[PDB]
Amino acid sequence: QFVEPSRQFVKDSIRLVKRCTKPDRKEFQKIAMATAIGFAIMGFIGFFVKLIHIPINNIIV
Amino acid sequence: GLKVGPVPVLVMSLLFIASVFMLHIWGKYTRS
Amino acid sequence: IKFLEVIKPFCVILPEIQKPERKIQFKEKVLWTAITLFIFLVCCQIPLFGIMSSDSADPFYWMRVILASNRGTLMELGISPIVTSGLIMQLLAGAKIIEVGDTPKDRALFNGAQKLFGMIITIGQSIVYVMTGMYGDPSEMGAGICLLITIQLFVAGLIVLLLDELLQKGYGLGSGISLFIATNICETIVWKAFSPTTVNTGRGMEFEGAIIALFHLLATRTDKVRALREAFYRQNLPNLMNLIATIFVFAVVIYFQGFRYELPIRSTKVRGQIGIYPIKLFYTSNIPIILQSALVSNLYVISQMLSARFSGNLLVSLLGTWSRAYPVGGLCYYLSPPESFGSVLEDPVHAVVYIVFMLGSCAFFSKTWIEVSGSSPRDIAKQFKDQGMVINGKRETSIYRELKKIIPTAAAFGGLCIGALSVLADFLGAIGSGTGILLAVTIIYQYFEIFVKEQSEV
Ligand SMILES: C/C=C(\C)C(=O)O[C@@H]1[C@@H](O)[C@@H]2O[C@H]3[C@H](O[C@@H](CCCCC)CCCCCCC(=O)CCC(=O)OC[C@@H](O2)[C@H]1OC(=O)/C=C/c1ccccc1)O[C@H](C)[C@H](OC(C)=O)[C@@H]3O
């Protein structure tokens, strides 16, 4: 009789999502731009470090 | 224990990087 | 506290970072974070010295991108020892084996035992890497070369511990481990889009970076639609639809990251401090994903080692059969994402089992970590009582009930959502994988929260 606990959990899930505070368009844009800036910074810094270190890795090994 | 600062960590990180680089270069020199 | 006391003589031998005495300015914190990130990124490209052969199969390839690892380099162990030590310390504290304590002496002992366990795990993992066929045959390399490699990995792990501690103590923006994971994942995603590496298999020179490959194909075939479809639908190399799926997954996890329940809280001791207590839908930020990925990778490695040492046994066949080796049957096959949509159609039972396992494991890890990490509704009610905070609409007595009606459901549904996001990213073929993209976006959200906190305070 595990159908009832699962149904109760599902009902709680939709209830919570209904009373969750979804991001707005301005908030979503702010978070998206911040994540894009962070991703660009870290990913491109690592990419340039790897690109620089490829020739030295070839030279030493 | 050995309560040290940030510069004694940055310097040691660069020293370890230089040490492994010198190890590789010395290996290259001694292989030939 | 007895367990910490007996190991205190061993815990007072490893160095620790100086506590800052003036509050560190945001610019100085950014400078320190950048310096530590540059040190880690330089270390993760420098190879070891004693490696004799890096041609053998790699058994830990799976979660290398999220372990901040890179095979054959100084950062080969990555974050594994630090995360393992943190996990075991949290398990000991939550399950009431040791006491973290509200005393600086107790905190010092806790943070010394954590680093001691991290160093022990570093040594053990280095020995395992050496002795399980990596670097070449250990007998051929020799005891001296094995010891030299172990010392190099030992010092690299010490450096990672020192940089992580430097970032934690107040010199940096956040935590070293999260920064390293997110940086490695973002670096992998950027590399699979803008790399200059060229591989030729008969058709000609073709960059394996997706966008550079698109530009090169446009230049070579003069804007031909065949070149466009080769750039988008490239199976053998990273393509552009994988990038589109990656961006879509980032957008969706960003949308679901801002989901939160806003509890209107009033302070009764310091009257007038009305505020809001947010219960994020992603209650346990990425702990369920980390736990599930670690469990699955450990199961894969154990299955490979058992099928190697104990080939022919029925039990190891039930635990998983292999054929980079990929699972074909057994327990480990059902824990692996389906290869493609055709694989889903051929074996719908496997896809259903994989989805069910992902969602259930994520939910279980979330609802267990809320009880082990001290974020259970009872603990939140206890800190509410300690700090005098009360919910506006509800009575002071009905504070634990309101948290019990939200926090367990929030944790469980956050587990389902964060497992479904990983499953969707895996199905869509997104560069970085479900785990990598989820970890990266959650860590960047944490750093964005740090930014909007410190800038607002400034
Ligand atoms: C983003 C980073 C990740 C995903 C990560 O950090 O994942 C490593 C994982 O990395 C490590 O597995 C090692 C493994 O470590 C072993 C420790 C002893 C070392 C040899 C003597 C694990 C043995 C117990 C496992 C059974 C329980 C299991 O399956 C269940 C999984 C488990 O709790 O595991 C712990 C670590 O287990 C695991 O951290 C975590 O999930 C921590 C999560 C957490 C959550 C909340 C707070 C704080 C922390 O050694 C291998 C050589 C290899 O290491 C490498 C790649 O170099 C394996 O990959």
- Concatenating the DSSP letter of every residue in B1-32 gives --EE-SHHHHHHHHHHHHHHHHHHHHHHHHH-
Q: How many CB atoms lie within 10 A of CB C268?
A: 12
Q: C242 with C192: CB under 8 angstroms?
A: yes
d(CA A31, CA A25): 10
CA–centroid distance, residue C84 to ligand 1 (Å)? 5
Which of C144, C139, C79 has its CA nearest to residue C294?
C79
- Please give the CATH topology (third level) of the domain spanning C2-193+240-457: Preprotein translocase SecY subunit (1.10.3370)
Number of domains in chain B: 1
Q: For residue C239, what is the DSSP state?
A: -
Buried b or exposed e, range C64-84, using 16+ CB within 10 angstroms: bbbbbbbbebbbbbbbbbbbb
Q: Please, how many CA atoms are within 13 Å of residue C350, restricted to the half-sphere of its CB?
A: 21
d(CA C452, CA C439): 20
Name residue C125's amino acid: Q
Kindly report the protein residue whose alpha carbon is nearest to atom 44 of ligand 1. C87
- Concatenating the DSSP letter of every residue in C77-130 gives STTHHHHHHHHHHHHHHHTTSS---SSHHHHHHHHHHHHHHHHHHHHHHHHHHH
Instruction: Give the residue extent of every domain in chain C.
Output: 2-193+240-457
Q: How many CB atoms lie within 10 A of CB C259?
A: 20
Q: Do C189 and A39 touch (CB under 8 A)?
A: yes
State which of C87, C180, C292, C302 you would mutate to test the pocket of ligand 1, scoring each by most atoms of that ligand within 8 A of its C-beta: C87
Query: Which residues form the domain of B25?
Result: 1-32
Question: Nearest CB to C74: which of B1, B4, B20?
Answer: B20
Using the atom order of ligand 1, give the atom closest to the CA of residue C289.
4
CA–centroid distance, residue C65 to ligand 1 (Å)? 14
The gap from C-alpha C56 to its chain's centroid, in whole angstroms, comes to 26
Report phi then psi at C224, rounded to 5.
Answer: -75, 140
Kindly report the protein residue whose alpha carbon is nearest to atom 30 of ligand 1. C295
d(CA C248, CA C430): 9
Three-class SS state of C17: strand
Report phi then psi at C145, rounded to 5.
Answer: -70, -40
Kindly report the protein residue whose alpha carbon is nearest to atom 58 of ligand 1. C298
Q: For residue C432, what is the DSSP state?
A: T
Q: How many CB atoms lie within 10 A of CB A2?
A: 6
**C279 membership: H or E segment, kind and range:** strand C275-280
Buried b or exposed e, range C322-361, using 16+ CB within 10 angstroms: beeeebeebebbbbbbbeeeeebeebeebbeebbebbbeb
Q: Do C49 and B9 touch (CB under 8 A)?
A: no
Q: At what angle do helices C143-166 and C176-194 cross, to 10 degrees?
A: 110
CA–centroid distance, residue C132 to ligand 1 (Å)? 17
